[PDB]
């Protein structure tokens, strides 16, 4: 699963929310958060699209978008407010074990970068979504309703942080809807010096190795060497 | 399979018994065949073919390890033992080969008369 | 009077790097799972008693 700022359709922890980092005091390192229970997210593109074919050469066709029938509305995702509040409370409780009993922990949105990094980017049934998660990370913690994230759609895609190979995604016909589980986070910390009693965490991501490091973290590969020599008191006849 | 990794040496001595994916499969098959053949040949050149515990004719040099038989088979694991005698493995391996060649020559000499 | 004895099948292992292949549960998909080996229905797992190993999440090959 390729996504940023949010791990989807993965595995869950078994006892508590897990916080992992290479060096937790180095703020240049990403923090990986593994959830205990998943958070449902509903994403939809509600336009009824149309596809047309244009012959650009002998045996070559280009699939363009025709006319949307009906009204034109914005694509969006929905998350539950209470479940997100509970999950953030648990994450804060487990994060305080590395920063102390009495530190103020606040969540603020991302800051700077390209659209892939500053937004929750994913792919729902052919279409590529980039959603604004400024309502997910906006709070401060001191020791029925829904949250709607508006999303944009892009058709020319640059993957794997490469330059020189773009890809065009042909249109998908009809309304699009999907349901996913949020099961983790990728976070970063700000370098607050000069006797800072508060810590600020911002969503991160962009490198896909951290996505599959959250699945291959309990595995290692070893080589078997089933041949040994030892001393005894017995001799070959 | 690897179930006696944490037991003593003596306890463990009783229980010794194209495309992206298509290219990766073939290398694994070749590696498995290579490893099996190498182990079988190494066992064979020592005269130990067809056995899981094989008695040799090479005396143990006390400079390899000076411990008694009580703190080897009742106090260590094979992973601990492998860390001690890792520097002397090739010496013993050459000694075994020379010893087996001498045995072959002696058997030929016995059949000669 | 001690002699060398050879044991074939001892439980020793070392850290290594190798090529892992793919197995998938038994057509046009980006990751060609149709070219992968079928999966065993009930895989075998062996618990290793009295064994402590060292893992590193951030240097996995």
């Amino acid at each position, epitope marked *: 699963v390729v996504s940023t700022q949010l791990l989807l359709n993965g595995s869950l922890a078994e006892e508590e929310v897990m916080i992992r980092s290479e060096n937790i005091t180095n703020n240049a390192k990403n923090i990986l958060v593994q959830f205990n229970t998943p958070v449902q997210i509903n994403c939809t593109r509600p336009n009824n699209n149309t596809r047309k074919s244009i012959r650009i050469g002998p045996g070559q066709a280009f699939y363009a978008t025709g006319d949307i029938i009906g009204d034109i509305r914005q694509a969006h995702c929905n998350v539950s407010k209470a479940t997100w509040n509970e999950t953030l409370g648990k994450v804060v409780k487990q994060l305080r074990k590395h920063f102390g009993n009495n530190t103020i922990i606040r969540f603020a949105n991302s800051s700077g970068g390209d659209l892939e990094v500053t937004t929750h980017s994913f792919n729902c049934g052919g279409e590529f979504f980039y959603c604004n998660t400024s309502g997910l990370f906006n709070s401060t913690w001191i020791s029925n309703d829904s949250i709607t994230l508006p999303c944009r759609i892009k058709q020319i895609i640059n993957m794997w942080q490469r330059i020189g190979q773009a890809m065009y995604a042909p249109p998908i016909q009809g309304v699009i809807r999907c349901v996913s589980n949020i099961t983790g986070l990728i976070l970063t910390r700000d370098g607050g010096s000069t006797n800072s009693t508060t810590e600020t965490f911002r969503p991160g991501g962009g490198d896909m190795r951290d996505n599959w490091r959250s699945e291959l973290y309990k595995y290692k590969v070893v080589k078997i060497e089933p041949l040994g020599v030892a001393p*005894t*008191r017995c001799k070959r006849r | 399979f690897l179930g006696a990794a944490g037991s003593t040496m*003596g306890a463990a001595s009783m229980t010794l018994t194209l495309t992206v994916w298509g290219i990766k499969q073939l290398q694994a098959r070749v590696l498995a065949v290579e490893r099996y053949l190498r182990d079988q040949q190494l066992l064979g050149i020592w005269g130990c073919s067809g056995k899981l*515990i094989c*008695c040799t004719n090479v005396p143990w040099n006390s400079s390899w390890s000076n411990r008694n038989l*009580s*703190e080897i088979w009742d106090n260590m694991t094979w992973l601990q033992w492998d860390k001690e005698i890792s520097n002397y493995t090739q010496i013993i391996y050459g000694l075994l080969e020379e010893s087996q060649n001498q045995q072959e020559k002696n058997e030929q000499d016995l059949l000669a008369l | 009077n001690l002699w060398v004895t050879v044991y074939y099948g001892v439980p020793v292992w070392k850290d290594a790097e190798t090529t892992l292949f793919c197995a998938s549960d038994a057509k046009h998909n980006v990751w060609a799972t149709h070219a992968c080996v079928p999966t065993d229905p009930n895989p075998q797992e062996i618990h290793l008693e009295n064994v402590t190993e060292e893992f590193n999440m951030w240097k996995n090959n």
Partner: antibody, heavy 127, light 107 residues
Framework: EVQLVQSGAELKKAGSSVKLSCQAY????????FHWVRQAPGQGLEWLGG????????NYTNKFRGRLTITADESARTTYMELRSLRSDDTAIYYC????????????????????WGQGSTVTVSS | IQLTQSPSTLSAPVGAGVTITCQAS??????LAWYQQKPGRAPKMLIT???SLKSGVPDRFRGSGSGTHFILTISDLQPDDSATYFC?????????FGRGTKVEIKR
């Protein structure tokens, strides 16, 4: 640490049978060696029988041939000693002991003695 | 195989060294062990393989010998050492014990 736990005291009559159990903790049961040793009041130690669960063939002294049986339950990690046709001289304290062994291949097993002992069970044969 | 222990009883002061001799009817190589038993308690193994000391045993106990003669030496006698010492052979079945040597502290 390896620990052996035995059953409680027993009173029996002459001609009856007695069964004692010994449960092992902290070792792989199948590859360990278990032995039974009895002590009469005011006397020395006597070896009755020894047995490795994996091999499964107990070894007995000739004085107790036909009256002594040593069995093992691997799932319960227990070993049982059964003595039959009890006599007045069979009143004693019975200990269950354990020790490690190793193999050099070809039916050869070498031992180190009994390193772990149980607390003992008192068996009294009287009317 | 019969194991003969000498002496049957022994009394010595604290800090003194005592010697117990175990003799085998036939050779048993190194398969001899020394056990100590206190009244009302299970035996505790002191020496294995004739001369190898068990873990946790004080160094004042030493074992020696081979063939058919073995020796157990207690160099620094202590009041805690009053007990019965046994030699046991485990080289050949059936395993046999000695008749025991009683060591008493003289004060």
């Amino acid at each position: 640490e390896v620990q052996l736990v035995q059953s409680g005291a027993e009173l029996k009559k002459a001609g009856s049978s007695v069964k004692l159990s010994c449960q092992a903790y902290g070792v792989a049961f199948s590859t360990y060696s278990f032995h039974w040793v009895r002590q009469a009041p005011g006397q020395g130690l006597e070896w009755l029988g020894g047995f490795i669960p994996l091999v499964g063939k107990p070894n007995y002294t000739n004085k107790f041939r036909g009256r002594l049986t040593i069995t093992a339950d691997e799932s319960a990690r227990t070993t049982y000693m059964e003595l039959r046709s009890l006599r007045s001289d069979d009143t004693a304290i019975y200990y269950c002991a354990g020790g490690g062994a190793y193999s050099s291949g070809g039916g050869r097993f070498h031992y180190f003695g009994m390193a772990v002992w149980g607390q003992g069970s008192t068996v009294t044969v009287s009317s | 195989i019969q194991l003969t222990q000498s002496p049957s009883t022994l009394s010595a002061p604290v800090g003194a060294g005592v010697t117990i001799t175990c003799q085998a009817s036939q050779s048993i190589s190194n398969g001899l062990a020394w056990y100590q038993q206190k009244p009302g308690r299970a035996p505790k193994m002191l020496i294995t393989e004739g001369s190898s000391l068990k873990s946790g045993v004080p160094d004042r106990f030493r074992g020696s010998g081979s063939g058919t003669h073995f020796i157990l030496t207690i160099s620094d006698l202590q009041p805690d050492d009053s007990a019965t010492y046994f030699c046991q052979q485990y080289n050949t079945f059936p395993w046999t014990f000695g008749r025991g040597t009683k060591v008493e502290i003289k004060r």
